[model samples]
Target: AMDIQPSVGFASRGSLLPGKVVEGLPVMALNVNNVDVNFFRVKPESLPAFISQWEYRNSLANWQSDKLLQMADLVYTGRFDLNPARNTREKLLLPLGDIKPLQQAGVYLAVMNQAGRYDYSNPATLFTLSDIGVSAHRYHNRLDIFTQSLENGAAQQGIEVSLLNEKGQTLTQATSDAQGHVQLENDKNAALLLARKDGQTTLLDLKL
Candidate 1:
C-alpha cells in the first residue's frame, strides 16, 4: 500500500535521498492510510553523529519503547488519516522559517506504515553537512574501505565489504582487517560500497 521501495542490490535509488530539505521537511505515506507519525528532535550539530550511530528504522508498535537503538528525542507526535489513494497530493509540513529552533534544533520525521509489520522510516536534516555512517577512499589500484561500529563508533572488524559496479554487479569483495580496514580491487564502473557486519548494512557512495 506504499510506494517506498529500497533497492535490493547495487543499483542506485536515483538522485533523491528520501525527502529534500526545503523550507520544511516533507513526509509522505504514498497510498498508505492512517500512518502514525512521531517527530523527533536532535541537536543540529549532533545529527550526523546520531545517524551515524543508528540508522533510521521501524519502531514496530510501541515507538516509545523502541526495540532498536535509541538516540533522537521525541518532541511531539501524531497520525494522519489519508487513504485517498493515488496522486491527489496534499502536503502537510511545518514551514520552519523560525531561525531559532531551525538552526539550533534539528528534527527527524518518523512514520509507521503498518501495525503488524515491522516497518518504519525516518527523514531528518542529515543533509545539512552532517557526516554520518561509513566512508571510503579510492587508490590507484584498490579501494580502501573503512567501517565503524554503530554502537561505539570504533573500527568495525570482520565486516564483509563489497564493491559494486553501475549495474549493481559486484566488482570485488573482501573482509575487513582487525582495524576495520579492507582493500578490494577497483573497477572503472564502481559506484557503491556495501559493508555488512552483525546483520547491519551500510552503503557508502563512490564517484570512481
Candidate 2:
C-alpha cells in the first residue's frame, strides 16, 4: 500500500499564491491486498482530473527511448518537480507495493505529473509499438494477423502486415481492418510475420 499526501494551491503570473490553499480537503483510499492506501484529498471530482494529468504525463514518459519509466521509478521522481517557475500544488507518495503496477503499465509520466513535474499535454518523443500476432487455420489453409493497443486491447486498423518465408522473402502483405484483423492464405513452410505502421514494425514467428 502507498500513502499519498496532496495539497492544492493557486498559481499567478508564474508563482503560487500563498493565501489560496483550499480547505476541508478529503482523502481518497484504495485497497491493495490487506493493506489500505490513502490519497490526499481535494475538492469533489477533482481527483480524476489530477489522475488524468498523471495519465497523460505517464503516456509521455512511456515514449522515452532511453530509460523508460515504471511505477517503482515514480516514487520520488514522479511528483511535483517540474519547472520551478510554475505555480501549483502537488505532493505524492507511493508504497513499494504500489510501484509494480505503475511500472508494468509504463506510467512514469503520470506519476511525475501528479508530482507537478511533467506537463501532460506535451508530445511524446519515443515510438514504442506493441507486438503483433499471427494465427493459422489448418482446415481453411489461412492465417490471421492483427495489431492492437496495449492499453485497451482495441484494434489498430490500417496497419500493413506482411508474411515472410525462411529466407526472408515476402510471401504476402495486407492492411488491417477496423478490428485490426487481417486474413491471408497460409503457408505451412513460412517462418516469419511482420507488421508496419507509422514507421514502426513488429516481427513474429509463424508457428504454423
Candidate 3:
C-alpha cells in the first residue's frame, strides 16, 4: 500500500541491511509517501497511515529468510570504498557472494519502510528526513549474540550495524553498547544487535 523511496544511506525492504547503521549509529528510514508527495500531491491525513504500514510487506519475508551474512559483505567489502581506513579501503567485510550460507547464518534483515519529511497530519510545517521524522527504520532483525544488551530490544537508544556482501542481501541491525566487547567467535562479519530484556542495548561496527 506504500512506495519505498530509494536512498543512499537509508536501507530498503528486502534489501541487504534493510536498516542497519555504521559506527554504532542506527540507520534512518525514508517515507516513500512523503517523498512521493513532495513530487506530487498527497492527502496530509493519509501520510501517517502510509508510514505506519510501510513494512507490512517485507516483514513477513524477512522472518522466513536468513540472509544476514550476505548483507554483511555488501555493507563493508564494496569494490568502491565507502569508508577508508588509512591508505586504502578497509576490507573488513567478508565476500560470500551467495545466499546459501547467509541463509544458514540464522540472522535476517528488518522491513522498515518508514522515514518521512514531516507530520503530514499537520500541513502547517514540513519535516525533513533529519527533523521531526517518523520512526520505522530499524526493524530489529539481527542476531542477538552479536549485539549488545540495551533498550531491551529496541533500536532507539543504540547504534546501528550492517552485514553485506557483493551479491546483495544486506543484513542491517542496531546495538546499544558503547564498546565492541561481545567477544563472539566468527563475528567478524556478523551484524550486532543491541537488545536487552532489561531495556538496555548497544551496537558496534565490526568492520571498523
Candidate 4:
C-alpha cells in the first residue's frame, strides 16, 4: 500500500481556497477534484489520469522483445508515478496481481520513458521527475545504464537490436525489421536488455 501525498499542488494548510484539498486533505487546485488515492484491480481503471498513456496502449500489440513481463509489472504498479506531468483528466490503469493474461497474449519489450516518475511507497516528493530525467529506459526492474548511454552515442539511432542484460546476455536477441522494431518475449523474465548492431555481429556488451 502506498500513500500518495499531495506535495506541491494547491493543497496546503489554510490556503483560503475552497475544494483545495481532496478528501479533506490539502491538494493542488488542479487536483482538488482529483482522485488522489487509487487502487487497481486486474483491469486498467484503478489508477489516476496521468498514469494512463493511452496513446501507446495500442502500440503494445506490435511490441516484441524480451522485457515484456518486467515492463508490464512496472507500468501496472507505477502508473501514477510514470505520468507525473500528465493532465488530471487522464485516466490511469494499473495492473492487477496476475500476469497470466498478458503472457497468454504475447507481449514483450517496451521503451520505458526515463523521463517518467515512480512513486512506489508513500509520496516522498523527491521521487518526482522534477529535475533528473533519466531519458534512460529500464528492462524488467533492472536499470540498463548501458542502453541509456548508447541512446546518446548513436548517430542514427533507431531500434537496432533487442536489448541485453547487465551480464552481456541477450534478453531478447532479436533482429530489427524494416520498421526498426524487434518483437520481445512475454515470459516470466521478460525484461529489456541492451544490444547494438555492428555489421552482422549485433554487438551487445561494449567489451565485445
Q: Evaluated with lDDT, which candidate comes out highest? A: 1
Q: What TM-score would every model get versus the actual structure? A: 0.41, 0.36, 0.18, 0.20
**What are the RMSDs of all candidates, in order?**
12.5, 17.8, 19.1, 18.4
Candidates ranked, most accurate by TM-score first = 1, 2, 4, 3
lDDT, model 1, position 26: 43
Per TM-score, the best of the predicted structures is: 1
- Name the better of 2 and 3 by TM-score: 2
Candidate 3: C-alpha lDDT: 0.25
Model 3 Cα lDDT, one tens digit per residue, 1-208? 2543322222222221222222221222222121111111112222222222222323442321223222222211112123323333122221223324222221222222224442222111111111010112222452333332222433232333333222222444333354422222343344322222232111222332
Say which prediction, candidate 2 or candidate 3, comes out ahead on lDDT: 2
Candidate 3: segments with Cα more than 4 A from true spot: 1-181, 186-189
lDDT of 4: 0.26
Candidate 1 colliding pairs: none
**Please, what are the lDDT tens digits per residue for candidate 2 over residues 46-91?**
2223222332344332332222232123222222222221233332
lDDT preference between candidates 1 and 4, better one = 1
